[PDB]
From a paper:
To observe how MYORGGH31 derives its selectivity for Gal-α1,4-Glc, we set out to capture a Michaelis complex with this disaccharide. We used a catalytically impaired variant of MYORG in which the general acid catalytic residue was conservatively mutated (D520N) to allow the intact substrate to bind stably within the active site. After obtaining crystals of this mutant enzyme, we performed ligand soaking experiments. These experiments ultimately yielded structures with unambiguous Fo-Fc electron density for the substrate. Galactose in the −1 subsite is bound in the same position and 4C1 conformation as seen for DGJ, with hydrogen bonding partners being identical other than the endocyclic nitrogen and D520 being swapped for oxygen and N520. Since the wild-type protein binds to DGJ, and the D520N mutant binds to Gal-α1,4-Glc in a near identical manner, we can be confident this is the interaction network the wild-type protein uses to bind Gal-α1,4-Glc during catalysis. The glucose residue bound in the +1 site is held in position through hydrogen bonding interactions to D213 and R504, while stacking interactions between the pyranose ring of the glucose residue and W426 likely serve to increase the overall affinity for Gal-α1,4-Glc towards MYORG. In particular, the binary substrate complex of MYORG bound to Gal-α1,4-Glc explains both its requirement for galactosides binding within the −1 subsite and strong preference for glucose binding within the +1 binding site. In summary, the shape of the +1 subsite dictates specificity for α1,4-Glc since alternative linkages and monosaccharides bound in this site would form unproductive steric clashes. To assess the catalytic proficiency of MYORG on this disaccharide, we performed more detailed kinetic analysis and were able to observe Michaelis–Menten kinetics that yielded values for KM (980 ± 7 μM), kcat (0.047 ± 0.003 min−1), and kcat/KM (49 ± 7 M−1 min−1).
Numbering used by the authors:
A (entry chain D): 88 to 165, 169 to 270, 276 to 713
B (entry chain A): 91 to 165, 169 to 270, 276 to 713
The structure:
């Protein structure tokens, strides 16, 4: 059976574009159709029975929303689980989108075998199976086809590398999804090029942020206490850090005071031991020209002076019967988690944040955690969440009153929250496993999902022992190369500072701060103001401007800021040159060279330790 | 044998030809053409709808006078069989402690099968109480034991007078280690013989006897008298007042609340400034002391953190974190008595209280799985959740001599006292005066000889009290009188709360208990170890062929030789008394030797109980 350019068989379907290329192929894996049960009424193709003879609500509806776009609405509705296997295709077909992951490849590459698991916001820092804090049920092909899985679906995702398939599953057994009868539905749209079809899908499904964060956050470096000091942060260390930033002649968007400044997790005011005179600390920081943000989280531990208050006022996520709080474990221990569906728990959280601003003139907050992997398997909330990841959304709404200098590390339809979105903890390693090579794939993936204001975590990574190339801190060359690429991303955050290394590392950092300020920042601010209208990302893949270009489809070592700044950092140790691809148009190099014969690969393009290759539209 | 199997159910007859058991299949019907016989085994492979089935009936003749029928129905589809109680002449005993306790068993209205698990029935007429067994006995000398394997749920239907026996795994605290309903129906010559066979087969006997003074001297509890507000001064004033009114004491039981928070084991220094001195004074005044304990650690307990970190608590289903519970004293965790570490932790605190304060033993309160979460996990798995109650009652074993528990799930071989759940200060069968004999008989039937019928006069809860503030004078006296003849006797609201006559009546019944009742209780207690027979016996125990003895809920036996007939109604100075076969000497000296007989309008004044001794 043919529905426009879609071939339906018993065991699956395939779709072609007008050129006659196969741009989508899908197998039914929880059963087969009985084609004799299928009838066509206009654009609608419905089927009533499976091949085994079970009743079924299946349909394919053809929709022509534009002259150059054909969409296919698909529904398979049976307690029997639904699975369709979406084939990525041959080596020339490259896919983008889905979730932030621990090992982030661009284009998407998933190794081995994974049985479908809940497609929900998880902390992937320790897990290569899980799906990260920022995700969307959206996959885009370099062959100008895209799939959006319906928000209704109790959606689980697996993969099979042998047949290079995504396993799309709807199920209600062994999952944190509740019903408001499994149901897998989605829309496949086919366009003329990858950029056009992407823009159609983004405008249809994702909201835009309508505001821009503080302009200094797109220019001056952010300074975090976390990687430098860890939990042992205190009043003296914060002031010594602030002083050292000024003496080494660096600007600051703000200083972010991290874990731990409270006596217990759940308390909001300062530990009087480690911060004897917080008021004085903030007065000195204000006088020295530092805005300040504070690390906050949705947890109240059992030994918090606020745990009792939360239980009695019922501000916590509950066990399934909805009567008592449910205990959770996070990286800082055991307690409850605040229910952001509950107006009282929202007012309670907000009240403590407004008190910290009122008292200490704190500008905004680092909103840490927010993943449903830190909620119990099965739970209840003041308002029901059949889709559990909507809890992540509700937590990110806590940033709205302080959006201007706020960061969150989760996004579930959080795109219209006009704050920064931080990548989960990068490790001080070179590789794609949360390392230097993960940065461009991860930022591109997040940008694709409609989150323009991206903070790529910490320059040099978090320097976790056993996860650090160089033992104690990231090795010198890793720090420099990271610093360089980080200078061209929308927000830039140091923790382990340049003066931990040597005068040359400091000099390189000062150079990239100055270059960021004069070249990058004016363009970031223009593009940030443009988001409100266009909904286009700030960090763009090479294929954005060269959508018909197979090399631009594959590249993970280069990116664009808007359409006009092309960046090609060195991402390998012991290299003073790299290959640079210029995809289309005329490009002026940082040294003044005019390249007007494109597309072209520049072979062995010189880039010394203290340099990055960048090119501007001509 | 004498079992007729049809498609829709079966019936069983005794050798006299009476129908002693009738059961309907309610989750399907048998295809009789699928049934074949190999010796005593009758197996069937398909239902009437044509579904595959593991069904069998095996005939077993274990004794000359006993025929048993092993039945299995094994299908995720729930199994339900409806057991018919029969006509008005058929009377049934056993099952669970209930809020409204009738004898024989009477269940009103309609109840969908619900989990047959240890619950706190104080506020609930549907639920099954802390002491229960899947065991039902007929006055027609038939009994059923439901297999321990069954994920067993019980309902009832008063219209057809049926028990609804259900096996299901959906919406229940039962986990599997495929629903399965199996049971054994045994038929004997008389109700007492068949009961003794079933008890010896299924229930263990306690091999030890509690402290002899617990069967003689009254127990004194602070609970109904003082409530939570109990203090060091109040405990000492109570102890003094017991001595000044010339009463003996087995021991004084200090109840809720003596700790700063629930989960702490040592004394609140505010309400008990010098606990050591309090216990020294009580010891000098000749008082043994027991302490109220429970399996909960509240979130505001200084011990909650320790329990979380050492993982001593019942967990949520994934078995990683503690699960919070609500009980009558707030929100916290519950200790996992499947966990050796949590058992050692609990025991350690109890041994410290004995070592420090010379406390004799403990009141082990709660223990029902209705205070555990719907779905939970434990160090060792409990596919049958009520085994948690068993594991909690094992905490009494080292202090059994003066211990009480209020739950029993195969806890019979734990040689401590078993307390009825809170009696209310009312006359009726809803935890009132009329509930006492049915409840004690029901518990005795399940192989628990050492029974404590809670508090003389009840707990005096406002809105659940005949007389407002305390139980009305006549209720207190009648309760006191029947309580004097039960295996253990516990006052809380004391006689001197009322008047000199109530005190005098209490002193009389204390003296009578000491000289008549206590020597017999101790003999029968020592006999349990060998016979496994209860102390408190129904009239039908000695008169098993007697239809009147089958029905009576207002009389009981201590052993075979002491017959008790208390007044259980306000404004009555007489009652009808039934004497079964044999010769009886009344408390006034009258020889009744023309029996069985109904004594009509037998005089019993306010300060008296009717009792008779074998002659
Ligand atoms: C992953 O995909 C491969 C290829 O589709 C699956 O392997 C096939 O399995 C079927 C049985 O259903 C065999 O008859 C085929 O011969 C297999 N083909 C190959 C190339 O191995 C495999 O089953 C899938 N794995 C999972 C976990 O679903
Ligand atoms: C911001 O984005 C959120 C999330 O998509 C929008 O919230 C949805 O709004 C519609 C219309 O009111 C509701 O029916 C949905 O239930 C909302 N979803 C959630 C998860 O809250 C919100 O309206 C957006 N606001 C703007 C102005 O863009
Ligand atoms: C006391 O009673 C308990 C419970 O009936 C007995 O424990 C059982 O012992 C059997 C056989 O050794 C085990 O297979 C069961 O697992 C135990 N059941 C439970 C629920 O714990 C115990 O053995 C009895 N002890 C004595 C001496 O009578
Ligand atoms: O503790 C402060 C720290 O928290 C977050 O990182 C933690 C992460 O969420 C865990 O998965 C990991 O095991 O532990 C990390 C801390 O050691 C946060 O992302 C980080 O920036 C910092 O705020
Ligand atoms: O509070 C001590 C008290 O506890 C027990 O009785 C409680 C019962 O378990 C609850 O169901 C009821 O709602 O509240 C009762 C206390 O008010 C116990 O049985 C009793 O003897 C005493 O120890
Ligand atoms: C997607 O979900 C919406 C809301 O549940 C529903 O109306 C629509 O029909 C679904 N689409 C398909 C193709 O099943
Ligand atoms: C530092 O801040 C000052 C004041 O806003 C500004 O004029 C200057 O351009 C900034 N320099 C850099 C390198 O960011
Ligand atoms: C009762 O349960 C036991 C243990 O699971 C089993 O072996 C036995 O056969 C069952 N009895 C019947 C009658 O099904
Ligand atoms: C109770 O039994 C009657 C008569 O046998 C029957 O008609 C009725 O449906 C039963 N009720 C329930 C709730 O099963
Ligand atoms: C009370 O206890 C005393 C001292 O042990 C004992 O001699 C007496 O027989 C007991 N009397 C009663 C009525 O319990």
């Amino acid at each position: 059976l043919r529905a426009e350019l879609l071939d339906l068989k018993a065991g699956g379907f395939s779709i072609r574009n007008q050129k006659g290329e196969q741009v989508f192929r899908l197998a039914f894996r929880s059963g087969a159709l009985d084609l004799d049960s299928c009838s066509r009424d206009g654009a609608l193709l419905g089927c009533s029975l499976t091949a085994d003879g079970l009743p079924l609500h299946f349909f394919i509806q053809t929709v022509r929303p534009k002259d150059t776009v054909m969409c296919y609405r698909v529904r398979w509705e049976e307690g029997r689980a639904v699975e369709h296997a979406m084939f990525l295709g041959d080596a020339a077909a490259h896919w983008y989108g889905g979730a932030e992951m621990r090992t982030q490849h661009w284009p998407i590459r998933l190794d081995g075998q994974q049985e479908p698991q809940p497609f929900v916001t998880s902390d992937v820092y320790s897990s290569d199976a899980a799906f990260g804090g920022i995700l969307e049920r959206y996959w885009l092909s370099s062959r100008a086809a895209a799939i959006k899985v319906n928000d209704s679906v109790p959606f689980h995702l697996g993969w099979n590398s042998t047949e290079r398939s995504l396993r799309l599953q709807a199920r209600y057994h062994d999952t944190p999804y509740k019903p408001p009868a499994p149901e897998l539905s989605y829309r496949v749209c086919v366009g003329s090029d990858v950029t056009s079809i992407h823009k159609y899908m983004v405008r249809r499904y994702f909201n835009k942020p309508s505001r821009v964060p503080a302009p200094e956050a797109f220019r001056d470096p952010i300074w975090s206490t976390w990687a430098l000091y860890g939990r042992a942060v205190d009043q003296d260390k914060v002031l010594r850090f602030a002083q050292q930033i000024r003496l080494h002649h660096f600007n600051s968007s703000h200083l972010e005071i991290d874990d731990m400044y409270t006596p217990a997790y759940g308390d909001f005011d300062f530990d009087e031991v480690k911060f004897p005179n917080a008021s004085d600390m903030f007065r000195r920081l204000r006088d020295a020209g530092f805005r300040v943000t504070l690390w906050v989280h949705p947890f109240v531990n059992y030994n918090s002076s606020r745990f009792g208050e939360g239980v009695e006022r019922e501000l916590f996520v509950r066990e399934p019967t909805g009567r008592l709080p449910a205990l959770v474990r996070w990286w800082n221990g055991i307690g409850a988690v605040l229910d952001f569906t509950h107006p009282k728990a929202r007012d309670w959280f907000q009240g403590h944040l407004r008190r910290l601003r009122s008292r200490y003139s704190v500008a905004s907050f680092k909103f840490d955690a927010g993943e449903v992997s830190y909620l119990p398997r099965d739970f209840s909330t003041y308002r029901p969440l059949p889709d559990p990841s909507v809890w992540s959304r509700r937590y990110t709404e806590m940033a709205l009153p302080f959006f201007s200098l706020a960061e969150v590390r989760v996004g579930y339809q959080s795109q219209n929250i006009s704050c920064f979105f931080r990548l989960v903890n990068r490790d001080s390693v070179w590789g794609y496993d949360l390392g230097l090579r993960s940065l461009i794939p991860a930022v591109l993936t997040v940008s694709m999902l409609g989150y323009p204001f991206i903070l790529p975590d910490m320059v040099g990574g978090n320097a976790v022992p056993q996860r650090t190339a160089g033992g104690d801190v990231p090795e010198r060359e890793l720090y420099i190369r990271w610093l360089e690429v980080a200078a061209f991303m929308p927000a830039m955050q140091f923790s382990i500072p340049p003066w931990r290394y040597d005068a040359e590392v400091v000099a390189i950092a000062q150079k990239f701060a100055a270059l960021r300020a004069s070249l990058v920042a004016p363009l970031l601010l223009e593009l940030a103001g443009e988001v409100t209208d266009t909904g286009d990302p700030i960090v763009r893949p090479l294929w954005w401007i060269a959508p018909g270009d197979e090399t631009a489809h594959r590249i993970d070592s280069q990116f664009l800021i808007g359409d006009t700044l092309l960046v090609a950092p060195v991402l390998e140790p012991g290299k003073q040159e790299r290959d640079v691809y210029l995809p289309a148009g005329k490009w002026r190099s940082y040294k003044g060279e005019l390249f007007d014969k494109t597309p072209v690969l520049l072979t062995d393009y010189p880039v010394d330790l203290d340099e990055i290759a960048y090119f501007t539209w001509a």
